[PDB]
Amino acid sequence: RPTFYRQELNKTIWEVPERYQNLSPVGGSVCAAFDTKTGLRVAVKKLSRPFQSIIHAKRTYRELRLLKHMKHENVIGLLDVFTPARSLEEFNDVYLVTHLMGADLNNIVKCQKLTDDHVQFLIYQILRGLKYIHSADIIHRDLKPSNLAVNEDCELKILDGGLATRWYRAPEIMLNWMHYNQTVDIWSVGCIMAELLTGRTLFPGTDHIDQLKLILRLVGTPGAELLKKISSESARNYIQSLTQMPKMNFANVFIGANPLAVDLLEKMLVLDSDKRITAAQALAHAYFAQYHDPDDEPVADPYDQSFESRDLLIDEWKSLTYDEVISFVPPP
Numbered sequence: 667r668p669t670f671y672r673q674e675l676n677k678t679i680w681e682v683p684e685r686y687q688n689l690s691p692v693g694g695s696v697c698a699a700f701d702t703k704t705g706l707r708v709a710v711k712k713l714s715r716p717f718q719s720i721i722h723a724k725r726t727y728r729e730l731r732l733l734k735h736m737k738h739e740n741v742i743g744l745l746d747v748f749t750p751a752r753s754l755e756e757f758n759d760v761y762l763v764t765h766l767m768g769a770d771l772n773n774i775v776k777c778q779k780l781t782d783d784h785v786q787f788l789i790y791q792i793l794r795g796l797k798y799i800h801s802a803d804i805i806h807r808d809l810k811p812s813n814l815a816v817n818e819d820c821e822l823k824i825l826d827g828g829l830a831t832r833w834y835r836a837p838e839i840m841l842n843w844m845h846y847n848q849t850v851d852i853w854s855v856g857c858i859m860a861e862l863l864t865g866r867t868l869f870p871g872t873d874h875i876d877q878l879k880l881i882l883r884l885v886g887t888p889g890a891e892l893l894k895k896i897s898s899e900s901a902r903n904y905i906q907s908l909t910q911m912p913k914m915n916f917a918n919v920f921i922g923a924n925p926l927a928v929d930l931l932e933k934m935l936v937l938d939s940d941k942r943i944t945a946a947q948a949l950a951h952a953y954f955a956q957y958h959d960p961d962d963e964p965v966a967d968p969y970d971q972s973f974e975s976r977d978l979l980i981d982e983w984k985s986l987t988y989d990e991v992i993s994f995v996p997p998p
């Protein structure tokens with residue numbers, strides 16, 4: 667058990683091992699710091715109010731559980747996990763530690779003008795991660811350009827993968843729809859890609875209903891085929907109210923962009939989550955011909971998420987977590 671300094675950063679206080687030095691605020695709370703033990707730069711995240719509510723406490727175990735599982739180049743994982751306390755009784759803090767990344771993808775579309783080859787590498791990467799994630803039966807639900815960490819290199823990893831702007835949500839999340847599927851991430855990836863290629867937000871909706879309008883001026887109103895599946899004597903309904911729309915040509919909507927890419931968008935941005943192309947499929951798409959390599963798009967171990975499915979007490983969750991903290995084996 668390592669020696670910990672203590673120091674205060676802004677209002678938040680910080681209690682970490684000496685192997686990390688230079689703690690430096692990037693944004694619970696994140697600091698950039700130097701890992702003497704490996705001499706690589708890292709991100710230390712101090713979880714906010716870990717075991718406040720049951721809703722926090724479970725959320726804590728979830729985050730630790732996921733991060734412990736994520737072993738994949740395109741997906742944030744755990745270098746170190748640590749608590750200052752010793753024995754169960756003191757335990758009320760959790761700092762998570764990963765490879766520092768230092769820019770997110772929203773400060774890229776706001777810097778650069780990006781090449782087609784850029785979106786290529788970048789989107790491939792997103793789908794590389796996605797696909798490992800989906801293979802564990804986890805669904806992101808919030809992919810958006812601020813959950814994608816990119817380092818100076820143009821390397822990218824997926825942040826917050828399975829913890830949870832309306833702009834990147836599949837329509838089926840904006841219609842609640844309590845029980846959908848993994849292709850919701852695909853919709854987002856479309857929204858991200860479109861914007862990477864064009865420099866403007868695809869669907870900058872002002873609220874939840876404006877957004878289903880914006881989506882519709884593009885992908886068009888649903889065929890009686892899809893309409894039937896909307897669970898409503900009237901939640902339905904509510905769509906057909908709003909005028910009937912031409913499905914626009916992605917080709918013009920997206921003039922100038924590589925037509926491989928545009929064909930790819932036509933398949934991600936499909937109103938019907940059954941006809942939405944999967945992660946593993948979209949990587950076999952020509953757009954990624956440069957990068958693709960079947961024998962290098964790895965799946966994940968199966969992920970145990972029955973825990974999700976049950977009501978424990980604060981005391982029961984903080985205990986399980988602590989089990990997770992001390993049971994932690996670091997990588998290579």
Ligand SMILES: C[S@](=O)c1ccc(-c2nc(-c3ccc(F)cc3)c(-c3ccncc3)[nH]2)cc1
Nearest residue numbers: 696709710711762763764765766767768812825
């Ligand atoms: C969705 S909100 O925009 C949001 C922003 C940042 C983060 C966010 N969480 C982390 C973070 C840090 C350490 C971990 F172990 C896990 C995640 C980072 C991070 C990781 C590596 N290098 C720089 C920053 N960014 C999570 C949510």
